[PDB]
Design a protein around this motif. Structure first.
Motif, PDB file in Angstrom:
ATOM      1  N   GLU A  31      35.076  38.354  33.537  1.00 44.21           N
ATOM      2  CA  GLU A  31      35.156  39.810  33.549  1.00 44.21           C
ATOM      3  C   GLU A  31      36.568  40.349  33.718  1.00 44.21           C
ATOM      4  O   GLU A  31      36.744  41.545  33.942  1.00 44.21           O
ATOM      5  N   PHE A  32      37.571  39.481  33.610  1.00 39.30           N
ATOM      6  CA  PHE A  32      38.963  39.901  33.706  1.00 39.30           C
ATOM      7  C   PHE A  32      39.262  40.703  34.981  1.00 39.30           C
ATOM      8  O   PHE A  32      39.918  41.739  34.933  1.00 39.30           O
ATOM      9  N   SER A  33      38.787  40.220  36.122  1.00 42.06           N
ATOM     10  CA  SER A  33      39.100  40.857  37.393  1.00 42.06           C
ATOM     11  C   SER A  33      39.399  39.833  38.488  1.00 42.06           C
ATOM     12  O   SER A  33      39.172  40.096  39.671  1.00 42.06           O
ATOM     13  N   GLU A  35      42.238  38.884  39.559  1.00 44.20           N
ATOM     14  CA  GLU A  35      43.333  39.342  40.426  1.00 44.20           C
ATOM     15  C   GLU A  35      42.828  39.840  41.783  1.00 44.20           C
ATOM     16  O   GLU A  35      43.486  39.663  42.806  1.00 44.20           O
ATOM     17  N   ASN A  36      41.647  40.445  41.787  1.00 47.47           N
ATOM     18  CA  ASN A  36      41.065  40.946  43.019  1.00 47.47           C
ATOM     19  C   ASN A  36      40.873  39.869  44.093  1.00 47.47           C
ATOM     20  O   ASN A  36      41.351  40.033  45.213  1.00 47.47           O
ATOM     21  N   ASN A  76      43.565  47.105  41.444  1.00 48.87           N
ATOM     22  CA  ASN A  76      43.129  48.499  41.372  1.00 48.87           C
ATOM     23  C   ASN A  76      42.896  49.107  42.749  1.00 48.87           C
ATOM     24  O   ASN A  76      41.773  49.151  43.252  1.00 48.87           O
ATOM     25  N   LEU A  95      35.937  46.976  46.639  1.00 47.44           N
ATOM     26  CA  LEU A  95      35.873  47.068  45.184  1.00 47.44           C
ATOM     27  C   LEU A  95      35.000  45.940  44.653  1.00 47.44           C
ATOM     28  O   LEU A  95      34.060  46.177  43.888  1.00 47.44           O
ATOM     29  N   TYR A  98      30.936  46.108  46.007  1.00 47.57           N
ATOM     30  CA  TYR A  98      29.964  47.026  45.444  1.00 47.57           C
ATOM     31  C   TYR A  98      29.844  46.895  43.927  1.00 47.57           C
ATOM     32  O   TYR A  98      28.893  47.388  43.351  1.00 47.57           O
ATOM     33  N   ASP A  99      30.789  46.200  43.296  1.00 44.61           N
ATOM     34  CA  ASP A  99      30.873  46.139  41.841  1.00 44.61           C
ATOM     35  C   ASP A  99      30.665  44.718  41.254  1.00 44.61           C
ATOM     36  O   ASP A  99      29.571  44.391  40.766  1.00 44.61           O
ATOM     37  N   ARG A 103      27.152  42.107  40.484  1.00 44.54           N
ATOM     38  CA  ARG A 103      26.781  41.479  39.217  1.00 44.54           C
ATOM     39  C   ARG A 103      26.771  39.958  39.297  1.00 44.54           C
ATOM     40  O   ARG A 103      25.993  39.302  38.600  1.00 44.54           O
TER      41      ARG A 103
ATOM     42  N   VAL B 147      30.676  53.931  42.164  1.00 42.57           N
ATOM     43  CA  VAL B 147      31.127  52.580  42.386  1.00 42.57           C
ATOM     44  C   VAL B 147      32.205  52.311  41.361  1.00 42.57           C
ATOM     45  O   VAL B 147      31.922  52.156  40.173  1.00 42.57           O
ATOM     46  N   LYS B 148      33.440  52.253  41.845  1.00 47.02           N
ATOM     47  CA  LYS B 148      34.624  51.990  41.022  1.00 47.02           C
ATOM     48  C   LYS B 148      34.460  50.694  40.223  1.00 47.02           C
ATOM     49  O   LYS B 148      34.160  49.664  40.793  1.00 47.02           O
ATOM     50  N   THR B 149      34.635  50.773  38.905  1.00 43.52           N
ATOM     51  CA  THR B 149      34.520  49.608  38.026  1.00 43.52           C
ATOM     52  C   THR B 149      35.842  48.870  37.949  1.00 43.52           C
ATOM     53  O   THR B 149      36.895  49.484  37.779  1.00 43.52           O
ATOM     54  N   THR B 150      35.786  47.550  38.057  1.00 43.90           N
ATOM     55  CA  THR B 150      36.961  46.734  37.860  1.00 43.90           C
ATOM     56  C   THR B 150      36.628  45.674  36.815  1.00 43.90           C
ATOM     57  O   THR B 150      35.592  45.021  36.908  1.00 43.90           O
ATOM     58  N   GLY B 151      37.491  45.540  35.808  1.00 43.30           N
ATOM     59  CA  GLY B 151      37.346  44.513  34.779  1.00 43.30           C
ATOM     60  C   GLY B 151      36.692  45.027  33.504  1.00 43.30           C
ATOM     61  O   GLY B 151      36.737  46.222  33.207  1.00 43.30           O
ATOM     62  N   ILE B 152      36.110  44.099  32.743  1.00 45.69           N
ATOM     63  CA  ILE B 152      35.374  44.403  31.521  1.00 45.69           C
ATOM     64  C   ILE B 152      33.968  43.827  31.632  1.00 45.69           C
ATOM     65  O   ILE B 152      33.794  42.640  31.919  1.00 45.69           O
ATOM     66  N   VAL B 153      32.972  44.674  31.398  1.00 44.60           N
ATOM     67  CA  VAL B 153      31.568  44.309  31.564  1.00 44.60           C
ATOM     68  C   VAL B 153      30.825  44.547  30.257  1.00 44.60           C
ATOM     69  O   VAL B 153      30.773  45.675  29.774  1.00 44.60           O
ATOM     70  N   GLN B 172      41.384  53.180  35.817  1.00 46.82           N
ATOM     71  CA  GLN B 172      42.599  53.388  36.587  1.00 46.82           C
ATOM     72  C   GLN B 172      43.759  52.716  35.870  1.00 46.82           C
ATOM     73  O   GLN B 172      43.563  51.751  35.133  1.00 46.82           O
TER      74      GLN B 172
END
Ligand SMILES: Nc1nc2c(ncn2[C@@H]2O[C@H](COP(=O)(O)OP(=O)(O)O)[C@@H](O)[C@H]2O)c(=O)[nH]1
Ligand code: ALF
Ligand SMILES: [Mg+2]
Lengths: 111, 317
Positions: A31-33, A35-36, A76, A95, A98-99, A103, B147-153, B172
């Motif tokens: 999901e390209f996240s 870094e978090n 972010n 972040l 909750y996100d 999933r 709910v702030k989205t981070t990434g690509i879904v 953002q």
């Protein structure tokens, strides 16, 4: 069995288990996240260290990797000493919680 | 098969549209799926009332009554009490009394001066329902969550014999560097703008107007050479919030050259033109614009039906 059950209870449980962190990293990559989590783990490292010179370099290093507007893995976040990144670490924690973590628990990686 | 990008600056309502696709073209939310949002409603509700109370301290607004100071303390004491999805009657009472207070209401009216969820008033005005031990959030409650989205879904659905691959992204500044990953072979882009942002400032830069940010972003996307053959749809979203706001707050905050009247119809028209004028290739390309309330299922159903018919038109040529 027990390991998967504990990751479902909270993000804290997931991030304390290093195998949990590995599987979660793999999910964030898709999901390209990623870094978090990397930024979060970096802050937990930073907390532990006591050497003023080893701390100043790492603080710069966290800033350039994760916090700079030019940074490649910019996190972010709602724009020296050990706990100086608390606000920011907590924000990235929430972040994820909750996100993407939400999933993660519905994913094949987990089930 | 259709590749659909949801793009827009943060909080423009992309994820809300994604939820609508589940409501309309999958199976709605189940009760169990709604139960999973309970914790998020409570967190959204608590963080909203807290944001207002911290704002009072910065902006130097007093409480309407002294006894609320004790309610304020108790709010923070119990703030983590709802993380397993239970709002205790003690906490419900604290939030009720705070929200009723004239000082709190005066600060809420100034929300423009700080960062506050759009859904704050929606939950807080409905605290009695939200408070019940038996509470199950409704689809509207779920659509209203933040709910702030981070990434690509990535998401899949079917409509009129077409398989939609749909991509939700974070809006953002930091998230935008990742957008280039799913730019290949894009059939349609739905670009969301928060109409109600015209007098707000960015979460990531308290000096920059949100609308101007959104325009700069649309300028970039709209004229990008990846999307020469992409059907570009514009969703001027939050029309409901915009309608209440334009009476109270002049559009000249955002567009100081605006000479028209501060009324829903003129103000909305002006914004539409501002965005459509950023299309450089007017001879070639066209923007399909719709005024949306993303949280309104009947509205989103109608708008998306039209959008789908456009896509069908533009994939015969
Ligand atoms: N009243 C109203 N609220 C909306 C509308 N669209 C989105 N929201 C709310 O605004 C917040 C931001 O929505 P979200 O989809 O997360 O923004 P995103 O960052 O672009 O994905 C959420 O709490 C939504 O429920 C709208 O048209 N009207
Ligand atoms: F751009 Al967002 F959650 F703020 F998708
Ligand atoms: Mg989103």
């Amino acid at each position: 069995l027990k390991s998967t059950a504990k990751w479902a209870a909270s993000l804290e449980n997931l991030l304390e288990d290093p195998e949990g962190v590995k599987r979660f990293r793999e999910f964030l990559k898709k999901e390209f996240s990623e870094e978090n989590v990397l930024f979060w783990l970096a802050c937990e490292d930073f907390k532990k260290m006591q050497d003023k010179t080893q701390m100043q370099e790492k603080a710069k290093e966290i800033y350039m990797t994760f916090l700079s507007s030019k940074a490649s893995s910019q996190v972010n976040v709602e724009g020296p000493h050990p706990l100086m990144f608390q606000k920011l670490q907590d924000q990235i924690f929430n972040l994820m919680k909750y996100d993407s973590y939400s999933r993660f628990l519905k994913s094949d990686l987990f089930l | 098969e259709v590749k659909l990008l949801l793009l827009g600056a943060g909080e423009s309502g992309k994820s809300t549209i994604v939820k609508q696709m589940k409501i309309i073209h999958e199976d709605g939310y189940s009760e169990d799926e709604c139960k999973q949002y309970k914790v998020v409603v409570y967190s959204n509700t608590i963080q909203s009332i807290i944001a207002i109370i911290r704002a009072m301290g910065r902006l130097k607004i007093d409480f309407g009554e002294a006894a609320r100071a004790d309610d304020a303390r108790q709010l923070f004491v119990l703030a983590g009490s709802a993380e397993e999805g239970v709002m205790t009657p003690e906490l419900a009472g604290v939030i009720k009394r705070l929200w009723r207070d004239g000082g709190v209401q005066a600060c809420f009216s100034r929300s423009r001066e700080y960062q506050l969820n759009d859904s704050a008033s929606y939950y807080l005005n409905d605290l009695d329902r939200i408070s019940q031990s038996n509470y199950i959030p409704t689809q509207q409650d779920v659509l209203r969550t933040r709910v702030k989205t981070t990434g690509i879904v990535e998401t899949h659905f079917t409509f009129k014999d077409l398989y939609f691959k749909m991509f939700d992204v974070g809006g953002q500044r930091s998230e935008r560097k990742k957008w280039i990953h799913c730019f290949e072979g894009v059939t349609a882009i739905i670009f969301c703008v928060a109409l109600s942002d015209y007098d707000l400032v960015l979460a990531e830069d308290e000096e920059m107007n949100r609308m101007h940010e959104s325009m700069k972003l649309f300028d970039s996307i709209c004229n990008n050479k990846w999307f020469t053959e992409t059907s570009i749809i514009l969703f001027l979203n939050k029309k409901d919030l915009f309608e209440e706001k334009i009476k109270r707050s002049p559009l000249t905050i955002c567009y100081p050259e605006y000479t028209g009247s501060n009324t829903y119809e003129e103000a909305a028209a002006y914004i539409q033109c501002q965005f459509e004028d950023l299309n450089r290739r007017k001879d070639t390309k066209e923007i399909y614009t719709h005024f949306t309330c993303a949280t309104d299922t009947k509205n989103v159903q109608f708008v998306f039906d039209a959008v789908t018919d456009v896509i069908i038109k533009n994939n015969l040529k």
